[PDB]
Structure formats: structure tokens, C-alpha cells
């Protein structure tokens, strides 16, 4: 199983996901960087359109948005048995153009894992 | 602490809540009955209105609404440094009436634990 943690790391920063099953439900809570939070909650099942939750900023200033919480809800959701609730939050300290370029492949790569967990064990 | 776990049990059945603190943002976690679920979501800060995403019946019929995630984000939203999410998922199967009375109270009390821990574990 009801819980797993998976590991991505590119262009030398870490996201990190950690799965937890409840009934036929899921919650994803992803982070990364140096300052982990939760900046944006997307929501969604199988059958509907995700809806996406935006936090006022983590630390006052203006960051980029990498639309992290959306793009692993796009990837994982015709895997779904129930309803799913992804958590984002990964903060880099002066992070960089390629470190930026990164969010998206380490997104994916952690939603590859966790697609490859769900079907292991089917809830 | 970053991790707590409450409980209350009142006429006959258990309501639970884990807290995850990450940065200066709050995750928790509301299960109870039988079939723990995630039904309701719940999204706040100290000084924004809170939004609830409400999910598909988790088994298809249609169960009353006791409100608990939205109830819980009234009781500490003062206390909040950050960003909350709350989840909620209670079902005991062939609830009785005393049972769903119960959910005030119960969510009141893990409320005023998870207050408590706050202001003991300041973030
Ligand atoms: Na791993
Ligand atoms: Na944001
Ligand atoms: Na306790
Ligand atoms: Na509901």
C-alpha cells in the first residue's frame, strides 16, 4: 503493497514520489530540490478531467511553473481504479535552464515507475 | 517531528488522521470506518477562502455528506504556516444514526490534536 517511494535524478537535482494506496484511491505526494513543498494538488480519476490547485509561492518571489502535478496526472490516468490526488512541490535554489529542462523527464520517469507499480499490484 | 498520527474513536468506530509536514506546508490524511477511502479534498491556506474537490461515490451509492475535510480546515486554517491539504475517506458499511452523528465530534477532536501538535512543533 500500500506504499512506495520512487527516485529520479537529472542534471544533479532529485524528485522523489511516494505512493500511497487507500481502498481504490491514490495520493502522490512528488518533491524535489533543495526546498520541498507542495505547491500545487492535482486531482482526477480515470473518467474525468484533472483540476489542478495553485498555492500562493512557497517563498514570496516568482518561479517558473513546470506544471509537474498536471503532467504525471496526464501520464498515469487511464490506470486509475479510483480517484487520484498528486501533491507537487521541488524548489531548486537559483535553479538552472537545464535543471529547468529536466522537470519534465524526471516527471515522466517517475510516472513510468509508478505505472509499472500500480500494474504489479492492481488495487 | 515531520510525521504524526491521531485517533478518535466514538460511538463504535475509528476516524484517523496522519499529518506529513513538508516545508512549511501540511499534508493530512482523514480515514476512518471499515473502508478507507479518499472522498473529499480539501485546499487552503491561513488567509485564503478553502476549495473542496468532492470525488464519484466511492462504491457507486449515495452516501450523506458529513463534510469532514472542509470541517477539519475550519478548525485549524488559523494555525496554518503554509500551504493544507486535506484528505478525507470515512465508510462503515450500514452507518447507523448515532454513527453519523459521531463525524462532528470526531473530526473536532483530531482537529484539536492536530492543533496541539502544531503549536508544540512549530514550522
Ligand atoms: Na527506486
Ligand atoms: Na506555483
Ligand atoms: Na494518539
Ligand atoms: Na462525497
Not at 500545487?40 to 509537474?68: C, M, Q, W, Y
Amino acid at each position: 503493497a500500500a506504499m512506495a517511494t520512487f527516485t529520479t535524478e537529472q542534471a544533479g537535482y532529485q524528485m522523489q514520489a511516494i505512493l500511497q494506496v487507500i481502498g481504490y484511491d491514490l495520493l502522490i505526494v512528488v518533491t524535489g530540490g533543495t526546498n520541498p513543498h507542495i505547491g500545487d494538488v492535482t486531482t482526477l480519476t480515470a473518467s474525468t478531467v484533472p483540476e489542478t490547485v495553485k498555492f500562493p509561492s512557497h517563498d514570496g518571489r516568482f518561479h517558473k511553473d513546470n506544471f509537474i502535478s498536471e503532467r504525471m496526472a496526464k501520464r498515469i490516468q487511464r490506470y486509475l481504479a479510483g480517484s487520484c490526488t498528486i501533491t507537487a512541490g521541488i524548489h531548486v535554489n537559483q535553479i538552472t535552464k537545464a535543471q529547468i529542462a529536466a522537470a519534465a523527464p524526471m516527471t515522466d520517469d517517475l510516472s513510468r515507475q509508478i505505472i509499472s507499480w500500480l500494474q504489479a499490484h492492481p488495487v
